[PDB]
Design a protein around this nucleic acid. Structure first.
Ligand SMILES: [K+]
Ligand SMILES: [K+]
Ligand SMILES: [K+]
Ligand SMILES: [K+]
Ligand SMILES: [K+]
Ligand SMILES: [K+]
Ligand SMILES: [K+]
Ligand SMILES: [K+]
Ligand SMILES: [K+]
Ligand SMILES: [K+]
Ligand SMILES: [Mg+2]
Ligand SMILES: [Mg+2]
Ligand SMILES: [Mg+2]
Ligand SMILES: [Mg+2]
Ligand SMILES: [Mg+2]
Ligand SMILES: [Mg+2]
Ligand SMILES: [Mg+2]
Ligand SMILES: [Mg+2]
Ligand SMILES: [Mg+2]
Ligand SMILES: [Mg+2]
Ligand SMILES: [Mg+2]
Ligand SMILES: [Mg+2]
Ligand SMILES: [Mg+2]
Ligand SMILES: [Mg+2]
Ligand SMILES: [Mg+2]
Ligand SMILES: [Mg+2]
Ligand SMILES: [Mg+2]
Ligand SMILES: [Mg+2]
Ligand SMILES: [Mg+2]
Ligand SMILES: [Mg+2]
Ligand SMILES: [Mg+2]
Ligand SMILES: [Mg+2]
Ligand SMILES: [Zn+2]
Ligand SMILES: [Zn+2]
Lengths: 69, 102, 55, 211, 91
RNA sequence: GGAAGGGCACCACCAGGAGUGGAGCCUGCGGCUUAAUUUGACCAACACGGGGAAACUUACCAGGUCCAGACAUAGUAAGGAUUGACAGACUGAGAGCUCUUUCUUGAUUCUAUGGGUGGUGGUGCAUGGCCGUUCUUAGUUGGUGGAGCGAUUUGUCUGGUUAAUUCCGUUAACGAACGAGACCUCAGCCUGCUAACUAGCUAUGCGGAGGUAUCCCUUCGCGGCCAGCUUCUUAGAGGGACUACGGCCUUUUAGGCCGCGGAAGUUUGAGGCAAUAACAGGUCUGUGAUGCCCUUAGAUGUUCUGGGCCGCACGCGCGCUACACUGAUGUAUUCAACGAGUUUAUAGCCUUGGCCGACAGGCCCGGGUAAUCUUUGAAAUUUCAUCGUGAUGGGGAUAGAUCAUUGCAAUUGUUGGUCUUCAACGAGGAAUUCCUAGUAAGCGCGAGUCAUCAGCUCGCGUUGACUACGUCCCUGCCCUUUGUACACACCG
């Protein structure tokens, strides 16, 4: 068979060396500060962060989105 | 303590059905009970006509398949316990017994 | 495929909603009396089912 | 709560499906047939086989597994359908058993002629009035052919065929294709009816000896 | 094939507890009649077991019948962490 | 065998009926066209593949997804192999299909090598099974004997007879085994048997109507499980026909013609089943039947969207509607059978009754898992009027407008209503099909397909004929004799 358009390539997740590492900040005294929000959904629970998009915050588990202006 | 017990017998084998009907009738008679029947309903003839060939070639020949169902009705004027005891007698395979009231 | 797309076409009726219970073919299905068997399979299994040829 | 027509058709379909499932499962174990008996709040399934030891397994493990799977597949209520295993009387008079034996012999590499002759002799010595074995397919060459072996009485037309003739057909998956084996055994009149039909042939007239 | 851990655990538990299992050849069936897991996942897990001989498979009239073997019983016991005393209901 | 003899067949004829072939249309095939218009089949293909395709079916075409690639080894990898996803763009598309933006999940996967799996993918000229045909005719083959050096032959036949290689007999054959027959199913008779509140009849009691209206007569409606019964209906067991009897012909046989009686005297009628040996006949597109070959992740796998299978200068096959008065239309009138029917969810299948509406249809009470309800269940036909020989009130092709139902979706009209338009067709050339009695033909009804569609197939009943009951002239079949330079067997 003959093909006109170039073959499509299936999506491959980009590799982040340490995505969790950048979600927390540790002070000298030992206090831990979270640089990203946590999803209020009960099912997601504590520890589940939401992406910091340039127009909103997105949760990867339940898909909840909060748009900020 | 007397009721009209309705007994419905269904089978594909006429001989077995008639033998079971006769056994039930004799059992009821031996107990001095009143027996009405057996009432033989019109025979149900399930008919299927299908083409013999598994393809479309050759003379179109057809197979006439029939499945005959025979039904009998027996009415007894007696009690549930006695009709149950009578129906407890051995029944050959292929005969379905149903006992109801009215 | 995507859940909303894969096998999403309704199949509530028509030849595509029924198949032979013996071989799974969707053609020449005998639905009379609930047999749900294609004609070839029914002709093969008629004796076992209880269908006799008298005429 | 279904009509009598649908009830009886469903009973027949269930019998056919159970027969096919049992044949597929117990092919090698030997499966003469199955019988289904319906009783109040209880159904009995009897498996007629030549090797009941294999069917039962060790301590009835295989038969218990078969009962459980049959119940689960056929929606039967728990502890309401139960399976028995039974020897087949005069296995030589059963075409299904003889057909399976011939299939085993052919799959074992035995010559077709020798296997068919042995089957014919066993059937005849088992008391059969007559018997016939047909083997069709690619034998010794790429061109298919038929081999017919026959000995004894045989009828082929009329009603008495349905009771005096017991026939079976089977397929053997050989290396180069499929071999079809047909076994046809003519029974003998049996007044008791256990080993043969309880009816004489239509054109058989017997005159009692005068005093 | 990708199967959730909970679904695999449920399938293995049911198989070990019952000793046998059937399944209609319906890939798109939402749920197995006897197991909450999808029919496709049940069928594919049973095929995986059969491939490595943990189960015996039979097909007839558009249905699968699976019977556990001794190796399958041992594997299920080890994987479910059940005591050696517990055995499938078939025995 | 355009050689002889004997016999047989409405897939042959004769004597005839209906016809087909001519017209419109439905449907299948070829051709053409097309992205595709998927494909098998050429007496024994062509309303056949149960093949009446909007989606599916679908195998074809233009595009988009997904793996439903087990298992083993190796690589990567918890400092994460890999899944899913909000928003924007992209896309036919609320397919994260893909890209941007980055969150979630955790060894279930990804990568490579082997090995699988699936395929309505090729091969029916590799096969199984099944079916059709040779072939609806009566034919076919051992054992032991006889003949021949042998292939072979007799049995299995001169003759008579039969539907029959069915019998009577003749006989180097005697005994046998298949086919035929017997057999089984349906229909035809039983005032005899058994039994019927899921079938009926009779009389009675009551009530309505009519007649002299009390009593009497006619006709309707309802109850009697302690009114009786089984003629009518149903279904089990049995009886019945065996050419039984009479007259003729025939070998003192097998048998044949006629005839009374009888329900039945063609094997009582119609079917089912059906031998040996074969076809390179059909089917791989019925099968988780199957060998080999091809493909197997940018798929010939699977799914989604749309289109096509229906495309129209043309030829052919099976059919439906007609050409009219033995008729069309509008009233009135009233006689079948084989069958089929639900998940009860507000309700699914058959639908009674009531209401709404011109129809198509809609709404509300309900019955039936059934001799319990639909089923109180057709048309042709009968009867009275209009029409008046005019392609006319025959014919209903084509087309416009519009309204309902099924379906997720009706456009290339799915189907069904109302009005309107009113084509060929005035009985059909050469050729050619089926048919001998409740048959042909006409008439309608049930089922299969079915969410909705029957001009088709399988059955059913209703009205109901003409002609013949003979032959080998044509087309073929069986046996014998005979010729052959044929054996791929005269399409030699
Ligand atoms: K014509
Ligand atoms: K045809
Ligand atoms: K074949
Ligand atoms: K001889
Ligand atoms: K193949
Ligand atoms: K099919
Ligand atoms: K002739
Ligand atoms: K002849
Ligand atoms: K000559
Ligand atoms: K010659
Ligand atoms: Mg015979
Ligand atoms: Mg016969
Ligand atoms: Mg003529
Ligand atoms: Mg014409
Ligand atoms: Mg075409
Ligand atoms: Mg012919
Ligand atoms: Mg259509
Ligand atoms: Mg499509
Ligand atoms: Mg399509
Ligand atoms: Mg495909
Ligand atoms: Mg062929
Ligand atoms: Mg000799
Ligand atoms: Mg000879
Ligand atoms: Mg009577
Ligand atoms: Mg061929
Ligand atoms: Mg077509
Ligand atoms: Mg036709
Ligand atoms: Mg009537
Ligand atoms: Mg006109
Ligand atoms: Mg008109
Ligand atoms: Mg002709
Ligand atoms: Mg059709
Ligand atoms: Zn969340
Ligand atoms: Zn089938």
């Amino acid at each position: 068979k003959t093909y006109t358009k170039p073959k499509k390539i299936k999506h491959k997740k980009k590799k982040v060396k340490l995505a969790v590492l950048q979600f927390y900040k540790v002070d000298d005294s030992g206090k831990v500060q979270r640089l990203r929000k946590e999803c209020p959904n009960a099912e997601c629970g504590a520890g589940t962060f939401m992406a910091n998009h340039f127009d909103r915050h997105y949760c990867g588990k339940c898909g909840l989105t909060y748009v900020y202006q | 303590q007397i009721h009209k017990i309705r007994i419905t017998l269904s089978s594909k084998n006429v001989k077995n059905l008639e033998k079971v009907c006769a056994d039930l009738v004799r059992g009821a008679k031996d107990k001095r009970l009143r027996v009405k029947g057996p009432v033989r309903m019109p025979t149900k003839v399930l008919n299927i006509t299908t083409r013999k060939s598994p393809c479309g070639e050759g003379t179109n020949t057809w197979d006439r398949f029939e499945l005959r169902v025979h039904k009998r009705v027996i009415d007894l004027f007696s009690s549930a316990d006695v009709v149950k005891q009578i129906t407890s007698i051995t029944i050959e395979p292929g005969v379905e017994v149903e006992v109801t009231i009215a | 495929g995507h859940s909303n797309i894969w096998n999403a076409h309704p199949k509530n009726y028509g030849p595509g909603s029924r198949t032979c219970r013996v071989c799974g073919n969707p053609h020449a299905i005998i639905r009379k009396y609930g047999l749900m068997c294609c004609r070839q399979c029914f002709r093969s299994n008629a004796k076992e089912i209880g269908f006799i040829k008298y005429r | 709560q279904i009509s009598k027509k649908r009830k009886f058709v469903a009973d027949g379909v269930f019998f056919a499906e159970l027969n096919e499932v049992l044949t597929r499962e117990l092919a090698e174990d030997g499966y003469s047939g199955v019988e289904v008996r319906v009783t109040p709040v209880r159904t009995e399934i009897i498996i007629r086989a030549t090797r009941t030891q294999n069917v039962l397994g060790e301590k009835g493990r295989r038969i218990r597994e078969l009962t459980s799977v049959v119940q689960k597949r056929f929606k039967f209520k728990e502890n309401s359908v139960e399976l028995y295993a039974e020897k087949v009387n005069n296995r030589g008079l059963c075409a299904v058993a003889q057909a399976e034996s011939l299939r085993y012999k052919l799959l074992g590499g035995l010559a077709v002629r020798r296997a068919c002759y042995g089957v014919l002799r066993f059937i005849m010595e088992s008391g059969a009035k007559g018997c016939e074995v047909i083997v069709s397919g690619k034998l010794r060459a790429q061109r298919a052919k038929s081999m017919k072996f026959k000995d004894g009485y045989m009828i082929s037309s009329g009603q008495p065929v349905k009771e005096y003739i017991d026939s079976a057909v089977r397929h053997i998956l050989m290396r180069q294709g499929v071999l079809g084996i047909k076994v046809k055994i003519m029974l003998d009149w049996d007044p008791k009816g256990k080993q043969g039909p309880t009816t004489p042939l239509p054109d058989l007239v017997t005159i009692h000896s005068p005093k | 094939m990708i199967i959730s851990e909970k679904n695999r655990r449920e399938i293995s538990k049911y198989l070990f507890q019952e000793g046998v299992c059937y399944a209609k050849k319906d890939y798109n069936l939402a749920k197995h009649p006897l197991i909450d897991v999808p029919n496709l996942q049940v069928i594919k897990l049973m095929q995986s077991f059969k491939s490595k001989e943990y189960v015996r498979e039979t097909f007839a009239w558009m249905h699968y019948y699976w019977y556990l073997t001794n190796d399958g019983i041992e594997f299920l016991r080890t994987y479910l962490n059940l005591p050696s005393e517990i055995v499938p209901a078939t025995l």
